Ligand binder design. Sequence first.
Ligand SMILES: *[C@@](O)(C(=O)NCc1nccs1)[C@@H](Cc1ccccc1)NC(=O)c1ccccc1
Ligand SMILES: *[C@@](O)(C(=O)NCc1nccs1)[C@@H](Cc1ccccc1)NC(=O)c1ccccc1
Lengths: 299, 299
Amino acid sequence: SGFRKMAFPSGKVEGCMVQVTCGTTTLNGLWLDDVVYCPRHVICTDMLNPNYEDLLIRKSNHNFLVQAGNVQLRVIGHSMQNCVLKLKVDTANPKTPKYKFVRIQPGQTFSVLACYNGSPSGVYQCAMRPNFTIKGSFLNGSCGSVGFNIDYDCVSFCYMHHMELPTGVHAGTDLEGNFYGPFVDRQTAQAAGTDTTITVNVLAWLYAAVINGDRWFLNRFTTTLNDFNLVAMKYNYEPLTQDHVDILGPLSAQTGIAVLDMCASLKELLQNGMNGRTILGSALLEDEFTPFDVVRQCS
Amino acid sequence: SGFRKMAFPSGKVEGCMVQVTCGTTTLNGLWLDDVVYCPRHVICTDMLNPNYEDLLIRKSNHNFLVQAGNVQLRVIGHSMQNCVLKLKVDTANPKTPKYKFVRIQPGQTFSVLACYNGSPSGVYQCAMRPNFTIKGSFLNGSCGSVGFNIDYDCVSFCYMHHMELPTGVHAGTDLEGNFYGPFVDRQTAQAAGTDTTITVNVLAWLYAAVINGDRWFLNRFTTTLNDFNLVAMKYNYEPLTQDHVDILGPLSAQTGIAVLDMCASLKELLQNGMNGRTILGSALLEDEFTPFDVVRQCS
Ligand SMILES: *[C@@](O)(C(=O)NCc1nccs1)[C@@H](Cc1ccccc1)NC(=O)c1ccccc1
Ligand SMILES: *[C@@](O)(C(=O)NCc1nccs1)[C@@H](Cc1ccccc1)NC(=O)c1ccccc1
């Protein structure tokens, strides 16, 4: 019993993290087979509007210093793909897990291994927000840290941390180097849009709470998809789709509570609040558990 | 920026987790040097009131099956220490980290690596509650999972999971096999006492929030230690000591807010609530960050 915000075991990623230095910029890199992936602004000193192409021109393989713990790696190639650099090294990482690079959708969750100078500091669970930011915990030197999911022995890398916005939220790329959302790797006038709540996730957490003993919010009412979406638009919740209803099926089946009945419970929680009660230890509705996360944790 | 509930990187522990089977009971074990540590109720089928001594009598080394991934380990010795078994195996774990066994105090936090059948499933941060339980997330088969802290390369094991109480909270031992609190490894009429809030931790989280931009709760008032403790007793918060004031010094120094001024802010939050605002993304006061956790994360 219990429901907690849980990350995947981080070991398979820890073995991949290295330190990359270029001139005087040190950040974190990700070493998989014979390539080290890092943010491209490792070649920068500038940040107002860098011509990354022209900055990479003054650089050769020997200008990139890659250190894996204490093992110094020999760089034999370098290229820019979008906003990442790929440093070919002469040795395969013996520690490379089975892995895939994946571009996730807003609403999906992942674990983050925060790193500084190539060394892991902590692990936590995050979500890609609807506005394509993540609410992380990152400090200077954290760029190059990565987000991932682990299915069986396979690591699905989905995020590389690049930057912190003036709002205190975080922006970054997939492992192909394309940013999530509209952000650019410059210090410019960029700011997060409207962050909306992830309705399908809230419902799944409501299901997690029933499985674990919290049921005061269960009402004697039901609703319709269109009726609920009117309420969600008012409260800046994302619209709920029949695809979302279908994904919640297994949770509906386990608990015997129909998705539309849970929607009417959420409806009442949105118009009435919690009246000083808590659900799974929180006085706010939680939207960073996917339906898959509830099933995995509760089974 | 950002403040999140963060666990230590779990890799050093993942390499220590094994599967222990005795008869038909399988649970998790912890393999360090040439000893595997597991809960002693691996030798049980009973649970009402087991005579553990007499159950261990019918067992020999070959009755304990230890599997580390797919490597089968050969047991050459066994003993009972308090509520754990120590299985001597013929090979040292090549993956053994530098480690220490530590009995932590209520109020202290640690990371938990939840395991099933010797395989890690997730990592999360927990605290030893004042009533010597932990509010974990554990399912059948999770016994033998461990809690730990990591300072530099040294793993400080502090918890082994044994049991879930009828209340849905969790109880377990240090790695010497002594339970935290009064619990016994039996299915009997045992229940958690009064859980109180960890005042020194709440204050440290209040400091974390100021560091990160949340300051609406900062008041134009101060208070005294005795005055505050009257308020804390009413709201079932632990008494605050001069030792606690001293531990918060570095956070006081960074932010320039005196501990007793923060106490007056907490005072007002306790008598008035949050009036529908949030602090660091929560509408409840958080007590599972130690002062050390705030500094480590915010630096
Ligand atoms: C990285 O870009 C980085 O850490 N990005 C993510 C952040 N999260 C919170 C704050 S920053 C590094 C690259 C770098 C630059 C210069 C020296 C060493 C590393 N950027 C910074 O660390 C940085 C951030 C803000 C102002 C100056 C420097
Ligand atoms: C462990 O004692 C165990 O998992 N303890 C911690 C728990 N947290 C939440 C639920 S239980 C195992 C040992 C065992 C016994 C029998 C077969 C395999 C393993 N106990 C249970 O898994 C168990 C719990 C509750 C009822 C029956 C069995």
